[PDB]
Design a protein around this ligand. Structure first.
Ligand SMILES: [Br-]
Ligand SMILES: [Br-]
Ligand SMILES: [Mg+2]
Ligand SMILES: [Mg+2]
Ligand SMILES: [Mg+2]
Length: 295
């Protein structure tokens, strides 16, 4: 169902001097849900229930996001993709996941998840993805409605737009959910970013990492690697498509449809589809896991 309550209480693990937060409920092989920008584990609160009894349900909060500690010093060079990966690789190692992990990913959680899978292919039982960064793109592939705003985040205007005005949280987030959110839901997303300044840096560093028109070259190279790999991987996949969707449309959606051993469903939503169609998403993920783990 819909609802504002979180799925569980956060547990914490020390990673490289910082405390990282995550939800971890149940037992069994892991079903790992990874949020992206400007969200946290809260994104999956109404989807995880569908997998009750199917595995150890885990949702990690990326460094500087959700209830995971903020990095200090922080500034323009902080919270880039490689730094997020360094922290997340360590947390996932610390979680003792074993070799039958089902990844459920979104946005930057998909770039991080796809990259981890390419590097630990034998430990990945299945991948469910939605509104993902499945390959490097061009501006022509970016949703028309926010193209100018995202070019702005990537310019020097970003510090004012995000560190001062918190536009990713206050405007982009609700602007890409079809239904109006309650105050409690909005409060959950605003919480890690209530403070003006560096506390909001993760939500500005992220759009500056999207692999568009070849920049930043480093993330473009990483996405090219996992795109090439996924397009050829026999690992079972669940493509949770969205209408109208946002990122995974046009060229990128056509490319994802060429991926092998994949099942697809379409749900109503723009980018943060978990807020619009949680039960349809959860049900398909549960059906996918039951197929992968015949009881
Ligand atoms: Br972003
Ligand atoms: Br570059
Ligand atoms: Mg500490
Ligand atoms: Mg906090
Ligand atoms: Mg398009």
């Amino acid at each position: 169902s819909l609802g504002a309550k979180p799925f569980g209480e956060k547990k914490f693990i020390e990673i490289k001097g910082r405390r990282m937060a995550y939800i971890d409920e149940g037992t069994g092989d892991p079903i790992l849900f990874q949020h992206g920008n400007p969200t946290s584990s809260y994104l999956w609160r109404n989807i995880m229930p569908h997998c009750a009894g199917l595995g150890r349900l885990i949702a990690c909060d990326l460094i500087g996001m959700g209830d995971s500690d903020k990095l200090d010093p922080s500034g323009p060079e902080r919270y880039a993709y490689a730094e997020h990966r360094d922290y997340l690789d360590a947390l996932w190692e610390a979680l003792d996941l074993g070799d039958r992990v089902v990844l459920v990913v979104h946005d930057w959680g998909s770039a991080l998840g796809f990259d981890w899978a390419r590097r630990h292919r034998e430990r990945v039982q299945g991948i469910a993805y939605m509104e993902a960064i499945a390959m490097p793109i061009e501006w022509a592939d970016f949703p028309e409605q926010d193209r100018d705003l995202f070019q702005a985040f990537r310019s020097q205007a970003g510090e004012e737009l995000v560190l001062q005005d918190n536009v990713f949280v206050e405007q982009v987030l609700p602007g890409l959910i079809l239904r109006p959110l309650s105050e409690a839901e909005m409060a959950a997303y605003r919480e890690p970013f209530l403070a003006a300044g560096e506390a909001r840096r993760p939500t500005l560093s992220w759009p500056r990492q999207i692999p568009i028109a070849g920049t930043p070259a480093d993330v473009v190279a990483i996405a090219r690697d996992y795109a090439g790999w996924l397009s050829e991987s026999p690992i079972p996949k669940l493509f949770i498509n969205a209408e109208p969707g946002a990122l995974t449309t046009g060229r990128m959606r056509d490319f994802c449809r060429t991926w092998p051993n994949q099942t697809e469903i379409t749900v109503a939503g723009a980018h943060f589809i978990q807020e619009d169609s949680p039960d349809e998403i959860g049900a398909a993920i549960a059906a996918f896991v039951r197929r992968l783990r015949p009881a």
